[PDB]
Design a protein around this ligand. Structure first.
Ligand SMILES: Cc1[nH]nc2c1[C@](c1cc(-c3ccc(S(=O)(=O)N(C)CC(F)(F)F)cc3)cc(C(F)(F)F)c1)(C(C)C)C(C#N)=C(N)O2
Ligand SMILES: Cc1[nH]nc2c1[C@](c1cc(-c3ccc(S(=O)(=O)N(C)CC(F)(F)F)cc3)cc(C(F)(F)F)c1)(C(C)C)C(C#N)=C(N)O2
Ligand SMILES: Cc1ncc(COP(=O)(O)O)c(CNCC(=O)O)c1O
Ligand SMILES: Cc1ncc(COP(=O)(O)O)c(CNCC(=O)O)c1O
Ligand SMILES: [Cl-]
Lengths: 442, 442
């Protein structure tokens, strides 16, 4: 007693838009540092009947039975995770249940410190996530600043983490957790110095490596597993997995943390796990460990380097004047155009990037930069040579954003009126579309 | 630079287990009240490339651009949500972002009362969910009992909500929220009397209708929308959608609750929505409004009645001696066997049910019942006539559970040793398999 008519026939209305979405994704130059393109295999798992099953609990300690095959999938996924990130399953445990990055960071923070507990994180404006305790004066914006008591450290004038100020704050604040690893930070992290500071105060070291996860796995960047008590990552960014999250915990450094973390995820916060997610993660976490993926991850940095270099060659300023990872943040102050305006301009030419604060931006009302990243375009087959053109297209978009601001003014209402119909944007959009449309597309 | 090889080739290890899962599902009599079988159209959406996109925020207020097609899907999903549940988009709003039931209830509860706020819910032993403030003496088991201050009301000796006690407690405790709608409650709810009590103390009326959502939608049970401020529902149970959740809020009764709820979901708790979930939900909420689904939902109740009746005819006891909805809870006390033991026995014969508490169970260590439900088997096409056999199979399972308990003893360790190889279980498993294996299977 069900309708099994294919998606096109059952609901033509929805299918049209999803087929439109498919076209835009195919015809866009996607520089969103947090985005990627899933392979078919991952998407077969996301569409499997394994999501019919309720399996509240952990494997072999399930609430319901009939969970033998589900138990195998969850166990295989935790194994591949610990393998992929080069940790022994004796020293490191992992929870594969978090439905996303924000849930994992709240779950993990709760486990360690509990309600009212004290936490330190990088400020949002300076590169930190919302779930690192972000708040405004106006409101406790993230639950992490409300259910916990939170303090926020900044990056210095030159766009680097200021370890001295981290210690200034950590000795006076005496936090129970210090979070490092960030959403829009273009350089590597001194996890050792963070570990040093946490010991001095007795705090936990929490490393959120969602953006740089493949660099850590592939031993291309600093390994936080040597120093951190807790490591969280999403699975959908540079890892190229589905929308989910992983919580790692150092058993050896803190016995009893396994239960604290596992009990925080279920039953403190979540209910039934989403098994299709867990299964999809399994399928990617195989791929992570194959040397072809190290090849990929290397290409991500090589492209990121060549993209930073070409932008500099065209006299565009970058925060910290370069990158150690997959992402760049452009400082647009010399052109007197906001990231607000350049995002609209890049939208009009099928270039996905996002506006981003820079250290000089005191408040997040009108950020002076844009963030870009290479994971997505690398996945579609683009090499170092191809970055000059992306650099070219971005330069041309910046120049046209100056033109349109001179013509229509500094207000964003007025600015946007200039975009529809502008001959150069149409010209440029079409170049973008011709080159992007033809690239390998999983 | 990606591997486009099909799931079977890329990862044969995983595909085998998923193919196994598909066989067990096909060969099981699934009486899990909370489970169902997704149609292929829902699973095509769950496996779409629409999950590649980061769209933090709400429609037309997205942080990043390139979200025009994602905006249509989210808008379309909210429309069908409001349509399906018979509410005008002027009086009622709805958030479609929650990743699951447990997240939606925590998000909604925060919005209304905040950290340290007071909440009332049905006890877990009596039929409440964990996210209704569940705690034990030993620990604050759910975050809802920890980040909020919670008080827990029980059902009476006869397995009914005791409204006098709800008021006794609501006037003394003076909560800001009172939650109704439950996980294993076999009767309809007096939402009106709940509305009366909440007004009296000035509390919000929270209705969690995840288990009975289709009954509400189709006007077969009491409509909580006439009285409630907040209605939450999962989408994966009797609704037959993907794993997600919906938060409904009464704008008319409390203006400024739209933002309160929307801002609790993002950015208080979540980050990027999962668009494949949203698209999947859209595809099911089409189907919810079609009169064929009203036919389905009616069959769920018809089956549930006939199943309650047949179990009674075989001298099996039910909590409240019947059902108004999709689920029955069996009181196994007259046979001196636990739900614990009967679950294992039903597993051995490919019958999925779960152990459940009954009013007489003071503690939830060893429940004296099992919960069953008809949504999943009705989806596979089973009619009233077919419930006699399910009733037959269950009686036979109860009888064998007595036999094996006498032979091996009352300890669950000892009991289980009898199950492998038991001739009657094998005979009965094969009957189960022959009948289940052949039933229509989406
Ligand atoms: C959306 C999001 N999630 N996590 C992030 C962000 C980033 C971000 C968050 C925000 C952000 C700022 C404020 C809020 S808010 O406080 O909840 N709220 C909407 C503002 C208020 F209060 F209404 F006025 C929510 C998100 C803003 C920006 C920018 F637009 F100003 F640039 C950027 C980007 C990756 C998009 C960010 C930065 N910069 C960092 N570090 O991390
Ligand atoms: C798994 C689950 N989620 N939501 C539920 C349940 C149910 C449930 C939860 C539980 C349950 C009981 C206690 C915990 S607990 O407090 O976190 N924990 C594991 C025990 C402790 F304290 F840690 F040792 C967690 C889950 C137990 C049962 C039963 F085994 F007693 F029967 C049943 C069933 C649907 C499975 C339930 C009931 N009865 C109700 N009302 O709602
Ligand atoms: C360090 C970090 N942690 C958590 C998240 C959030 O994960 P979910 O979206 O899965 O909740 C983000 C992405 N934030 C936005 C971006 O960088 O694009 C992040 O950068
Ligand atoms: C009333 C109610 N609310 C919320 C949830 C949470 O749903 P998620 O699993 O999507 O978090 C459940 C799950 N109850 C489990 C069961 O009855 O089988 C529930 O019964
Ligand atoms: Cl999903």
């Amino acid at each position: 007693m069900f309708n099994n008519e294919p998606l096109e026939q059952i609901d033509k209305e929805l299918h049209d838009i999803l087929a439109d979405e498919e076209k835009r994704q195919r015809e866009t130059i996607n520089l969103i540092a947090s985005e990627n393109l899933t392979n078919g295999a991952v998407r077969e798992c996301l569409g499997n009947r394994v999501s019919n099953k309720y399996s509240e609990g952990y494997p072999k300690k399930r609430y319901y039975g009939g969970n033998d095959f589900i138990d195998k999938i969850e166990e295989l996924c935790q194994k591949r995770a610990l393998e992929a990130f080069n940790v022994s399953d004796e020293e490191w445990g992992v929870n594969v249940q978090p439905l996303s990055g924000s849930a994992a960071n709240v779950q993990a923070l709760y486990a360690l410190v509990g309600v009212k507990g004290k936490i330190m994180g990088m400020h949002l404006c300076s590169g930190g996530h919302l779930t690192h305790g972000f708040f405004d004066e106006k409101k406790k914006v993230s639950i992490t600043s409300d259910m916990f008591e939170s303090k926020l450290y900044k990056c210095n004038s030159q766009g680097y983490v200021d370890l001295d100020a981290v210690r200034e704050m950590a000795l006076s604040f005496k936090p129970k957790v210090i979070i490092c690893g960030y959403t829009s930070y273009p350089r590597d992290i001194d996890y050792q110095q963070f570990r040093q500071i946490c010991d001095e105060v007795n705090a936990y070291l929490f490393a959120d490596i969602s953006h740089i996860s493949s660099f850590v796995a592939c031993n291309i960047l600093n390994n936080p597993f040597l120093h951190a008590d807790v490591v969280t990552t999403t699975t959908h960014k540079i890892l190229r997995g589905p929308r989910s999250a992983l919580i790692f915990f150092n058993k050896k450094r803190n016995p009893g943390i396994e239960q604290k973390i596992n009990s925080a995820v279920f039953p403190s916060f979540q209910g039934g796990p989403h098994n299709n997610k867990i299964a999809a993660v399994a399928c990617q976490l195989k791929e992570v460990h194959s040397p072809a993926f190290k090849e990929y991850t290397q290409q991500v940095l090589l492209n990121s380097k060549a993209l930073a270099k070409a932008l500099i060659s065209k006299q565009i300023d970058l925060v910290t004047n370069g990158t150690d990872n997959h992402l760049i943040v452009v400082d647009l102050r010399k052109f007197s155009i906001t990231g607000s305006k350049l995002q609209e301009t890049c939208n009009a030419i099928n270039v996905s990037l996002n506006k981003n604060t820079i250290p000089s931006d005191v408040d997040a009302v009108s950020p002076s930069g844009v963030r870009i990243g290479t994971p997505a375009m690398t996945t579609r087959g683009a090499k170092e040579k191809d970055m000059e053109f992306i650099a070219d297209v971005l330069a041309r978009a910046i120049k046209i954003t100056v033109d349109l601001q001179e013509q229509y003014g500094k207000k964003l209402v007025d600015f946007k009126k200039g975009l529809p119909g502008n001959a150069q944007l149409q010209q440029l959009k079409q170049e973008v579309v011709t080159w992007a449309g033809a690239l390998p597309f999983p």
